[PDB]
Amino acid sequence: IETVPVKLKPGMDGPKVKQWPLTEEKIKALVEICTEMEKEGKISKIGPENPYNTPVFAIKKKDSTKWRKLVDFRELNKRTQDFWEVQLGIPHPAGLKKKKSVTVLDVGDAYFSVPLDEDFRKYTAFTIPSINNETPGIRYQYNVLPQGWKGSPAIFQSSMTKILEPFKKQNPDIVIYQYMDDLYVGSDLEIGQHRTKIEELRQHLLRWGLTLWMGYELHPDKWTVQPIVLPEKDSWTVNDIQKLVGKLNWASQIYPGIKVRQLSKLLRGTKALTEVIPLTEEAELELAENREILKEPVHGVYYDPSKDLIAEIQKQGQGQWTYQIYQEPFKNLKTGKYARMRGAHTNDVKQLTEAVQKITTESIVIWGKTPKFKLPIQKETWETWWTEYWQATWIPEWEFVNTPPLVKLWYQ
Amino acid sequence: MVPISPIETVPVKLKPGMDGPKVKQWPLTEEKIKALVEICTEMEKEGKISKIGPENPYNTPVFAIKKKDSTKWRKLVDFRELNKRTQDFWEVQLGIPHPAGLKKKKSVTVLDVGDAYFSVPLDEDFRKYTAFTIPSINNETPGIRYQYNVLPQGWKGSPAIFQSSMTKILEPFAAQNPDIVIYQYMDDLYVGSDLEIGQHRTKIEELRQHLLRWGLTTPDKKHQKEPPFLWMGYELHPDKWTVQPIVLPEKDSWTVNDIQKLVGKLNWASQIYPGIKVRQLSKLLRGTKALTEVIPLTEEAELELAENREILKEPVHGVYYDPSKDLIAEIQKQGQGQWTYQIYQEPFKNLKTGKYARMRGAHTNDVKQLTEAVQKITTESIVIWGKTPKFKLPIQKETWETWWTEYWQATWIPEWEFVNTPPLVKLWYQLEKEPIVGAETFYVDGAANRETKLGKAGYVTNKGRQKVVPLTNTTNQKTELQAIYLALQDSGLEVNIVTDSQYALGIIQAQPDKSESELVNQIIEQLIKKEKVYLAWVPAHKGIGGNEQVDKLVSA
Numbered sequence: 001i002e003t004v005p006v007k008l009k010p011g012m013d014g015p016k017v018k019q020w021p022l023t024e025e026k027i028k029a030l031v032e033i034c035t036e037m038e039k040e041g042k043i044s045k046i047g048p049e050n051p052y053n054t055p056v057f058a059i060k061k062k063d064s065t066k067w068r069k070l071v072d073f074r075e076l077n078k079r080t081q082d083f084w085e086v087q088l089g090i091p092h093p094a095g096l097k098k099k100k101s102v103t104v105l106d107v108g109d110a111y112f113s114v115p116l117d118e119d120f121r122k123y124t125a126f127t128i129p130s131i132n133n134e135t136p137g138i139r140y141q142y143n144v145l146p147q148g149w150k151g152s153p154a155i156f157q158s159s160m161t162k163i164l165e166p167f168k169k170q171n172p173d174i175v176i177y178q179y180m181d182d183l184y185v186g187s188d189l190e191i192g193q194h195r196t197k198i199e200e201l202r203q204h205l206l207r208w209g210l211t212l213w214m215g216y217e218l219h220p221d222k223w224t225v226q227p228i229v230l231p232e233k234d235s236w237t238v239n240d241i242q243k244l245v246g247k248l249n250w251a252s253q254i255y256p257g258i259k260v261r262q263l264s265k266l267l268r269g270t271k272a273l274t275e276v277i278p279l280t281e282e283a284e285l286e287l288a289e290n291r292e293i294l295k296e297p298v299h300g301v302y303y304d305p306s307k308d309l310i311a312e313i314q315k316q317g318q319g320q321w322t323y324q325i326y327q328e329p330f331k332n333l334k335t336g337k338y339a340r341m342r343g344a345h346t347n348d349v350k351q352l353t354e355a356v357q358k359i360t361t362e363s364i365v366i367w368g369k370t371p372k373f374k375l376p377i378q379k380e381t382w383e384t385w386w387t388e389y390w391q392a393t394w395i396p397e398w399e400f401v402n403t404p405p406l407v408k409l410w411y412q
Numbered sequence: 413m414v415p416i417s418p419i420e421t422v423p424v425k426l427k428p429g430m431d432g433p434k435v436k437q438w439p440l441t442e443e444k445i446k447a448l449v450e451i452c453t454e455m456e457k458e459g460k461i462s463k464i465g466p467e468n469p470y471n472t473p474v475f476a477i478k479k480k481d482s483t484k485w486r487k488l489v490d491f492r493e494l495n496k497r498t499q500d501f502w503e504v505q506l507g508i509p510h511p512a513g514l515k516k517k518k519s520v521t522v523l524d525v526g527d528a529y530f531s532v533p534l535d536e537d538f539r540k541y542t543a544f545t546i547p548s549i550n551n552e553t554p555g556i557r558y559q560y561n562v563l564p565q566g567w568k569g570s571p572a573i574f575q576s577s578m579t580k581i582l583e584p585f586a587a588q589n590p591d592i593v594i595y596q597y598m599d600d601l602y603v604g605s606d607l608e609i610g611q612h613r614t615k616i617e618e619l620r621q622h623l624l625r626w627g628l629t630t631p632d633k634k635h636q637k638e639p640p641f642l643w644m645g646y647e648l649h650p651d652k653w654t655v656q657p658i659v660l661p662e663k664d665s666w667t668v669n670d671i672q673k674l675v676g677k678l679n680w681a682s683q684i685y686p687g688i689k690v691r692q693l694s695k696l697l698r699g700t701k702a703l704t705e706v707i708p709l710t711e712e713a714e715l716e717l718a719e720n721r722e723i724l725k726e727p728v729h730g731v732y733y734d735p736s737k738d739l740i741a742e743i744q745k746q747g748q749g750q751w752t753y754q755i756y757q758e759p760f761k762n763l764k765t766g767k768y769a770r771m772r773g774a775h776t777n778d779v780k781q782l783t784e785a786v787q788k789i790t791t792e793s794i795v796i797w798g799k800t801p802k803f804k805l806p807i808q809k810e811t812w813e814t815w816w817t818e819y820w821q822a823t824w825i826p827e828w829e830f831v832n833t834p835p836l837v838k839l840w841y842q843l844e845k846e847p848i849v850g851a852e853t854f855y856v857d858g859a860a861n862r863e864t865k866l867g868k869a870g871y872v873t874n875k876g877r878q879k880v881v882p883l884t885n886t887t888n889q890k891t892e893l894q895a896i897y898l899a900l901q902d903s904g905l906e907v908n909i910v911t912d913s914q915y916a917l918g919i920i921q922a923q924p925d926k927s928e929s930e931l932v933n934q935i936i937e938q939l940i941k942k943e944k945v946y947l948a949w950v951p952a953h954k955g956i957g958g959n960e961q962v963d964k965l966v967s968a
């Protein structure tokens with residue numbers, strides 16, 4: 001019930017981020033939420049002698065219609081000490097990526113029962129904004145551990161190990177990983193029966209609140225990394241072979257052996273784009289060898305936890321989105337594609353926002369880290385709208401792509 | 413005596429790793445010293461300052477300026493050196509309230525607190541650094557030493573500590589008087605209500621009672637003003653608001669100052685006067701960096717300032733916000749990357765207006781600019797009214813649908829409807845997704861010499877049509893574009909074009925309708941004329957049949 005000592009790393013002041021404008025209903029929701037939090041002691045009002053600020057806004061999580069407070073702690077997380085005093089943080093379970101089903105449990109509410117270092121509280125300051133700068137902003141700071149702070153799981157991890165030590169006691173089958181305010185629970189178990197030992201964990205969580213009601217069911221073994229595929233046709237146009245030669249040339253940066261000398265010789269001469277050309281036998285062989293080359297994985301592609309993970313996303317149309325995660329260009333550690341059906345049958349930005357959330361989740365499962373995104377969208381459009389569809393308690397970094405990449409063709 | 417409630421003290425420290433201020437007290441003339449001994453004596457007997465001994469090593473200089481047209485000397489301490497050392501305070505003074513955001517209250521009373529910041533206690537652990545010295549006559553005694561007991565004017569923390577304290581005091585009064593509104597911005601406190609003027613000035617009195625409970629004295633006899641007011645360059649009337657009437661300066665050889673005082677002043681007018689354009693006046697500025705330089709008006713400038721003038725001739729007014737009515741925002745394209753907008757709730761009566769200038773880009777199109785303006789208006793509206801307005805846009809619904817569905821980037825505008833007020837924003841060309849059967853296939857290429865800057869651009873087609881043009885003073889990138897321009901210029905209404913220029917692809921796939929480059933705009937002009945254009949890319953120096961034979965031809 002006593003504080004654990006927390007610092008920032010020297011040479012770094014606390015965060016001083018400006019609060020961005022909020023709709024009236026979001027401000028109202030935050031006022032109600034923070035008034036209660038103030039009553040419960042989780043937060044307290046703050047004077048102007050606190051120069052620090054972290055932005056805040058309000059959401060509606062998946063399948064729930066009452067507002068939830070989210071604090072963008074991205075800048076504070078950068079400036080927060082890295083917690084390797086007793087333990088070197090939580091080592092990522094390489095087995096969590098390998099389970100046939102994994103489910104995510106919001107454990108963030110458990111942080112609100114443990115106090116935060118009274119010396120550190122001044123750095124968690126946030127501002128409920130006013131409309132039209134009419135009245136000053138309502139300023140609060142955290143007394144308890146805050147959701148979204150990278151220190152909250154680090155501090156709680158010692159006291160969370162005891163909460164699961166009975167559960168992983170009975171189930172050495174089950175990998176449990178925690179990231180920010182989330183508990184990721186995984187097993188090689190059957191689908192109906194994986195739901196069963198979960199809800200058990202739900203109640204085993206209520207027993208210790210004496211001294212968080214729904215689930216997201218990922219399947220990290222229901223899918224895998226995506227190969228480069230070449231078309232299979234019986235008659236090829238000049239255009240077809242041109243596109244084929246282009247993608248082969250592009251893939252030859254990744255795979256060593258992709259030959260296009262036999263295929264490009266077909267393209268010699270200035271034929272109409274829609275004219276069929278029979279495939280030379282050596283051209284047919286060359287494409288066959290290129291196929292076999294494209295079926296093996298890339299050789300010597302390793303994950304390095306010292307470097308950033310980069311995620312690129314291409315909009316492909318009709319609700320489909322492609323993506324690749326890598327650390328060095330052309331050495332993807334994962335690729336995939338986004339489907340549809342999830343809102344925005346007419347809102348590109350909601351799709352991209354949901355796509356960013358799913359890729360971050362898969363990235364948390366595989367490496368225990370979030371990637372830096374390269375978003376195919378103008379900064380001004382993204383910035384204006386992404387918070388109105390955001391539902392996760394974490395937030396990744398992102399930059400904006402302003403030049404249309406030729407690679408969109410090749411991942412289609 | 414009715415007892416005063418104490419105002420809670422804001423703890424203050426100076427910046428980490430900084431000492432206090434130690435600056436020497438200027439030599440003052442004998443009359444000026446006499447004035448400040450007078451002032452500090454009453455302020456000391458008022459509890460606002462107090463003499464300090466020789467222990468305090470800190471010192472801030474103090475001067476005395478004389479009140480104009482009046483024989484009242486008053487005091488000035490230059491806190492600049494202590495301001496540099498004081499901690500940073502929090503910055504809620506991020507914006508200035510916009511008149512269009514105020515809701516029309518029937519009675520509104522504004523009370524200035526230019527007095528109360530001095531009745532608020534200063535943190536006593538910090539009073540030691542507010543020390544100043546009144547130099548004695550003939551420097552023959554130690555200057556009398558003083559320190560502040562309350563928020564000093566000109567000090568960094570005074571405005572933030574004053575407003576924080578004031579808000580603390582106003583909370584329960586506003587909470588237990590929901591039938592009013594209290595806004596607090598800088599030294600003033602705005603109070604409005606929808607009750608009869610009788611019960612207004614009663615509750616106004618009640619608030620002044622409430623601030624006496626903390627020892628904060630309030631304007632009474634007249635003093636507190638009721639609409640209209642000249643405030644922050646606006647004119648706030650009971651039913652209406654508008655820019656303070658401010659008229660254009662006139663010169664014959666306009667300097668940099670001349671319109672640095674006129675675009676920033678026509679920017680001001682553009683928030684209520686519809687259709688104010690600034691571009692042909694600002695090109696004259698960013699291209700120079702001398703605060704004195706003159707340069708004549710361009711041929712399109714005095715046509716625009718003549719249009720400007722035709723707008724600043726009659727007073728146009730803005731309405732106050734009604735939260736029960738819908739917010740509407742309407743945009744008009746005005747040309748040369750200029751966009752104008754009006755935000756309103758019923759026709760003919762704007763809440764506010766404004767304009768948006770395109771971003772400094774190399775290429776652009778109308779749809780991207782309209783999108784950017786929608787985002788600007790969206791954020792402005794959330795700032796001012798706390799909600800997103802419904803848009804009326806000069807773009808057809810099907811135009812927007814083909815655009816966003818085929819644009820490589822993700823994009824979105826919120827709820828909006830088409831308004832048929834030309835010039836309508838259009839899609840000027842659309843590339844094909846698959847090759848056009850029956851259309852001639854133009855294999856284009858270009859190449860230049862990095863040393864002579866000479867080069868060639870041309871094409872070979874499937875019907876045997878060929879062309880290679882020699883070019884001077886060009887680069888590889890220019891020739892690649894020129895080759896495409898030639899294919900477009902020489903082909904029928906439908907044409908397939910094959911290139912290896914990733915540079916050209918990048919420009920065209922971005923779909924610009926206007927460019928800085930003379931050559932891109934020609935290509936754009938050629939694309940508009942076409943019926944169907946399929947643009948196919950191949951990698952260079954693979955000798956592909958068509959883009960092997962023409963590569964050779966342009967480097968020969």
Ligand SMILES: Cc1cc(-c2ccc(C(F)(F)F)cn2)[nH]c1C(=O)N[C@@H](CN)c1ncc(CO)s1
Binds near residue numbers: 524600602637
């Ligand atoms: C009579 C009056 C009402 C107001 C007001 C109206 C609305 C709001 C709010 F809260 F609604 F935004 C806040 N204050 N200001 C004034 C006013 O005359 N202020 C004078 C000094 N007292 C000056 N302002 C700038 C000066 C030199 O730059 S001198």
